Amino acid sequence: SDFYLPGDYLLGGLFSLHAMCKEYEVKVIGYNLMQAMRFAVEEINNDSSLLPGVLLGYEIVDVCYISNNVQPVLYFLAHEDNLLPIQEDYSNYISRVVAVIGPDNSESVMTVANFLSLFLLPQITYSAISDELRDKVRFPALLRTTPSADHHIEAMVQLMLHFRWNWIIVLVSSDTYGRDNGQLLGERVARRDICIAFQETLPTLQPNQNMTSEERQRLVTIVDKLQQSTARVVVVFSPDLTLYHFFNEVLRQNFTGAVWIASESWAIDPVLHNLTELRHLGTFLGITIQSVPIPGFSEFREWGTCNQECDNCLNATLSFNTILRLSGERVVYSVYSAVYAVAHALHSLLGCDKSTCTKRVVYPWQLLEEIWKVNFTLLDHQIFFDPQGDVALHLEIVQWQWDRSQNPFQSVASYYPLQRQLKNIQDISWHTINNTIPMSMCSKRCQSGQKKKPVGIHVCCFECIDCLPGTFLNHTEDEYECQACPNNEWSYQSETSCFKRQLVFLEWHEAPTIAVALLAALGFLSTLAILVIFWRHFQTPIVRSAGGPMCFLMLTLLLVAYMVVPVYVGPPKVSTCLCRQALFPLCFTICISCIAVRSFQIVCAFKMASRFPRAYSYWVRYQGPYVSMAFITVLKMVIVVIGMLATGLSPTTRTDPDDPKITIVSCNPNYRNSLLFNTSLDLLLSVVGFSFAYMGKELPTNYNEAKFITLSMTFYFTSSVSLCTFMSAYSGVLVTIVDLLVTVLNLLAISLGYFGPKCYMILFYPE
């Protein structure tokens, strides 16, 4: 039969022909790889440059997926008489086979390598991707012709990164394959800023049998939890057998819009593509080995003890001939390269010089030692074994195309294990409306100048909350928290660049301030002329019966107040406010006190002289108005000093509600209470002064003093009430100019309503 070929050195094989093994259903891939190995050995026999004059044989034994993994290896290690000796050292042992091409799945390879470790027979497994075969401590004589699952996971991660998918879904199987792949991908993905929405285990369910109600509920739960999630990249680590029911129920629930990523198990499975209803679910990417065109192999394949036979293999392979031919060869080159690796190792071990061979007896451990160091070329591919027993064959991301006229599995990317880089990506026919890359992000990109706030355990998921007014976001420093701008400058909503608050204050060249300046200059000129006239006429009954020194000091203090009026306008400094609050309130209060004491002494003194005679005698012996004036003045310095100690001295900066962009500057941080106290004292003096004037309003006294005092004092009362109501009903930029207006007009009242009629009767009434 074709399962045996005598030669100088046999070369055992282990292929999964069914999934005794005869009663199981036949598999086409096993026979395909079997024919690959046969063709490789046959072409080794043909080639006179490789192994010249040394016939190479083989002994292929059918092994099931799991069931048969012990008897074939014992057959391999038995002598020609079917007896395997037991001894401590096997260096002198000669086995029937010289090497073995291991099974196609991880577990049977693990068993065969565990049992062959004693003898150190080389074993080049193919398409076994488990990473527990990477270490040579427990598998000293195990090799590979297929990149490990590490590179499959790396290709998947690079594919997600290239298309900007950072929110995925992992589905595994109850088997060890799915569990290990899921854990490996989860460990790999946590360091590339890609999150896993959820990982779920698909129950094991072989086809061609009826499912249970509990499993149906399980699947409907899986697909419900799949659909309710916002991730649109579903990676599946599961053998192709149990994925029929899951996809059937997915079609049943009518779920669409997911980019399925397939592991190597079902990325090239024909039957799932043959279902031909998956084309509406979305795109079906997958990871698989690059197809290497083996010359003169399709024609060779088409030309053609126990558990060592098959009958229905050819009939089964007949139906899948066209799909296999158009799809190319994926795992066939793995077996081809493994057989050539053994051949090159044996050729180098025999020390052949492409014409002669020493034909020395070969121990399998010697062949392993030589095969660990093979580096040749094969179909423009370099075949060399890495120190952990692998050869870097290019991987490939393949996108399923539902058209029988061309390749059912069309390549879209190539992965190079040596560089760990995925490159050469072509166009992919997506499932979107206008062929746009599907979006699989959990959190939208935040608008410029917006704080990022994590919402769950996943780092890539967050909520965008805008920065509150007065702060921005420095993306360079940290994008998770707002950073406010120092130096007393404000920021608007969603603003990343704080702007300096412009300092607005009373400037010389403005309309209200120039009006105030003109009014104050008119008052100053009028009162200066009044002083000039008063000094021009003295020894006059009006200026002598009334207080001469009193009026002179009052008018000089009014002159000073007018001259210091313009210090208000300009940049508010410490000296500015100091002189302002030490001159204006002092002078104004001293003027009001003099007016009140004059009205008192001209009206109420006559009435008081009747009840208290000695009080009047004391008042006239001394200078009662002078001492009362000094007492009120010292009270005023005391109160201004205590307000000084309370409210401070440095000019303040307050943000008006009108516009945070502007910042008015006054000199008193607490102006409301300070002006309230000042006006309270002024009005407490004003009420008694006005009452004293009004009780004696008709008396001629010193040329109708009570009448003018009354009119001026009522004018001040109304102006103070106007200030109070304006301040209570308004707070903004015009507060300072209003304070100037009211202060200067109060000064005008005190000047005019108490000195202007004097000048009137002096100039126009010389009688």
Partner: protein, 775 residues
């Protein structure tokens, strides 16, 4: 000592043996382990004791001798494979043939006492299963060894990990911690435990917040992920070393205390148990096995050690060459080891299966051909064997059944002790009244997820699986647009929303309506003011020829009364729906007649002042001109200047009917608003100046007793005007915005009432009641 010489014993049926007697390439030579292991020798002596006791008993295997081959297997499988091949080789020959199936084999050992390690047990069982060799393995626990598809001949005497993981899941479900974190060691033990616990938790409704693998002696990432979720119960299904490393790192980092559900690996390990600072890591509730102990094993082993020390016996009579150069204190550390009973019961189970297969009684046991190893399997399922007075059974999957004990750690003087607070025999039964927790009080640490979200909430999927929803309440102004939405959506800013609401409610306008009680009281005040105005007007037009009105104006008095009435009438337009024309014309129609009345009163005041405090020379010219056609011209000039100013600040200052969508909580606002203090301030400037000049010219006068005081009414009218508006301004500045037109109305109405009661009321009083003074 030659203790190793007894590792063989001839008999009709001889058992195998794989024990860890030793401990730890280019050539195919098996590595040799020279390090000595006390546990392996204790187990081998235990099985030797069991075999000797079987041979002592006459009711078990009568008239037969049972032997054993105690072979050394290091933890490595390469050194353990050769004893297996030796077992399967034909007796008396040193080779094993490769036949098609098991039936052609005649193994030299009836059964094999499998390896303690489970990683070795996998390979050994997979090799033996081809020949259907009965294997009973002490200590092999992980579950997939029970799969009869790949291990048809593999039995065991320790419970699988499935039973203890089911016990842990039932514990978590019974105490109510349905939101836990599962951890496992990096080896196969932890991975299998995590997978099994994943399945069990998914079945039982428990969710796993985070599934991570603690690496063998990274950890920082696993601890950070565990702490990221609000989980207070962590199942640590790890080996001794991984658990020790985890707990040491948590000690260094000062992790918050948690309820660690302990696997049997590290629950009773003294390395983890005596770790410094361990008392600050919460309660540790594990499920220790409940298995008997050989009460006579130490005496037996000490007797045979002393007896092998005797040269006579052993001289009268390798696998473990290091076992000969040992002494008694090199093994005394582990005499009370619970795997001794597992080995003892495995030997008894094999012997009982052999006895049943020979189907023979206590008196004797009939002669027959020697029984093949694979013939034991048909009789070793359902097997019921008594080991020291305790019955045990082999399930259909080769797993023995025994119960567990829920043991927690207690702490007094930093000395931890184990205490029984439960029992798992297939149905957990805990005594939680005596359990002492780590919380500040004796309260169970809450760790729970919301399986479903209450109506009106947004749901956010949590857990490693999409298990439980983090129900979140979001503030007012938002609603749950769809049940599947992650976050609630705002609505159109023109409609309010209550807290915890599925949908928004439309905002409806609420202005100053005609039915408001304040509106009613001000309408009553308006009607009273109108009645007073009409009465005064009738009085002044009836007695028009009297000196009263003649001195107090005349036609000007009636004109001012009509103006006051028209101000009262124009007060009526403030309320209601704020039509744009109405809001625009509020101020001018509320100010023109008031300006007219104020100007009339000011002309009266000016006449009084001229006749009072002016020289007669100017008086004879001013008095004769200030009354009559020139008075009409003056009041007309006042009215036209007011009208010009009114049109100026209506064309310049726009009075806007704004709709404040975000002032009232649940209802809309329609506000008639004008410029702040500038519009109505400029409108009030003329009235203020007229009133101020009137007050100034009137509030001093000489009122001789022989004349009527024509100034008191004017002074008090002007005073009332000033005080009512001064008090009004802060009322405008502080009253809630809806009642702002009502405050406007009150200002105007009190203004009219004050001017009436001060100026016109005193005149009318003497006009009606005492007409004897009108000369």
């Amino acid at each position: 000592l030659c203790l190793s010489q007894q590792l063989r014993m001839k008999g009709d049926y001889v058992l195998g043996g794989l024990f860890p007697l030793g401990e730890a390439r280019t050539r195919p030579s098996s590595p040799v382990c020279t390090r000595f292991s006390s546990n392996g020798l204790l187990w081998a002596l235990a099985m030797k004791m069991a075999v000797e006791e079987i041979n002592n008993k006459s009711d078990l295997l009568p008239g037969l001798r049972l032997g054993y081959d105690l072979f050394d297997t290091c933890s490595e499988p390469v050194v353990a494979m050769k004893p297996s091949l030796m077992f399967l080789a034909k007796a008396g020959s040193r080779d094993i043939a490769a036949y098609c199936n098991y039936t052609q084999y005649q193994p030299r050992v009836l059964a094999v006492i499998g390896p303690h390690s489970s990683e070795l047990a996998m390979v050994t069982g997979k090799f033996f299963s081809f020949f259907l060799m009965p294997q009973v393995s002490y200590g092999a626990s992980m579950e997939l060894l029970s799969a009869r598809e790949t291990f048809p001949s593999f039995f065991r005497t320790v419970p699988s990990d499935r039973v203890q993981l089911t016990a842990a899941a039932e514990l978590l479900q019974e105490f109510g911690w349905n939101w836990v974190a599962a951890l496992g060691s990096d080896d196969e033990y932890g991975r299998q435990g995590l997978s099994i616990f994943s399945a069990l938790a998914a079945a039982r409704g428990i969710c796993i917040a985070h599934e991570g693998l603690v690496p063998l002696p990274k950890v920082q990432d696993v601890l950070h992920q565990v702490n990221q979720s609000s989980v207070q119960v962590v199942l640590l299904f790890a080996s001794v070393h991984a658990a020790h490393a985890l707990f040491n790192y948590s000690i260094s980092s000062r992790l918050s205390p948690k309820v660690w559900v302990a696997s049997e690996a590290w629950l009773t390990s003294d390395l983890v148990m005596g770790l410094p600072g361990m008392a600050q890591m919460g309660t540790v509730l594990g499920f220790l096995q409940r298995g008997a102990q050989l009460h006579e094993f130490p005496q037996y082993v000490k007797t045979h050690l002393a007896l092998a020390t005797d040269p006579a016996f052993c001289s009268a009579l390798q696998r473990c060459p290091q076992c000969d150069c040992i002494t008694l204190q090199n093994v005394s550390a582990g005499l009370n080891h619970h795997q001794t009973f597992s080995v003892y019961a495995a030997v008894y189970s094999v012997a009982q299966a052999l006895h049943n297969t020979l189907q023979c009684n206590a008196s004797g046991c009939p002669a027959q051909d020697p029984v093949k190893p694979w013939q034991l399997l048909e009789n070793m399922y359902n097997l019921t064997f008594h080991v020291g007075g305790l019955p045990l059974r082999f399930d259909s999957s080769g797993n023995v059944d025994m119960e567990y004990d829920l043991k927690l750690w207690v702490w007094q003087g930093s000395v931890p002790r184990l205490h029984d607070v439960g029992r798992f025999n297939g149905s957990l039964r805990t005594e939680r009244l005596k359990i002492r927790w780590h919380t500040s009080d004796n309260q169970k640490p809450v760790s729970r997820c919301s399986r479903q979200c209450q109506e009106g909430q947004v749901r956010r999927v949590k857990g490693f699986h999409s298990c439980c929803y983090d129900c979140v309440d979001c503030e007012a102004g938002s609603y749950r647009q769809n049940p599947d939405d992650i976050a609630c959506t705002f609505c159109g800013q023109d409609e309010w929303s209550p807290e915890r609401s599925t949908r928004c409610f439309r905002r409806r306008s609420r202005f100053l309506a005609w039915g408001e009680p304040a509106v009613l009281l001000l309408l009553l005040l308006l009607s009273l003011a109108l009645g007073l105005v009409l009465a005064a007007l009738g009085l002044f037009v009836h007695h028009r020829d009297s000196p009263l009105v003649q001195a107090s104006g005349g036609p000007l008095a009636c004109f001012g009364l009509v103006c006051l009435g028209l101000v009262c009438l124009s007060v009526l337009l403030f309320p209601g729906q704020p039509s744009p024309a109405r809001c625009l014309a509020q101020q001018p129609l509320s100010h023109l007649p008031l300006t007219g009345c104020l100007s009339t009163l000011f002309l009266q005041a000016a006449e009084i002042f001229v006749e009072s405090e002016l020289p007669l020379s100017w008086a004879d010219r001013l008095s004769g001109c200030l009354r009559g056609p020139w008075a009409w011209l003056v009041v007309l000039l006042a009215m036209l200047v007011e009208v010009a100013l009114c049109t100026w600040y209506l064309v310049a200052f726009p009075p806007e009917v704004v709709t404040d969508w975000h002032m009232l909580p649940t209802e809309a606002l329609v506000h008639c608003r004008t410029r702040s203090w500038v519009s109505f301030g400029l409108a009030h400037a003329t009235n203020a100046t007229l009133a101020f000049l009137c007050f100034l010219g009137t509030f001093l006068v000489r009122s001789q007793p022989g004349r009527y005081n024509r100034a008191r009414g004017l002074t008090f009218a002007m005073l009332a005007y000033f005080i009512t508006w001064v008090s009004f301004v802060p009322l405008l500045a502080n009253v809630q915005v809806v009642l702002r037109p009502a405050v406007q109305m009150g200002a105007l109405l009190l203004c009219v009432l004050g001017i009436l009661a001060a100026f016109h009321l005193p005149r009318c009083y003497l006009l009606m009641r005492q007409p004897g003074l009108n000369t």
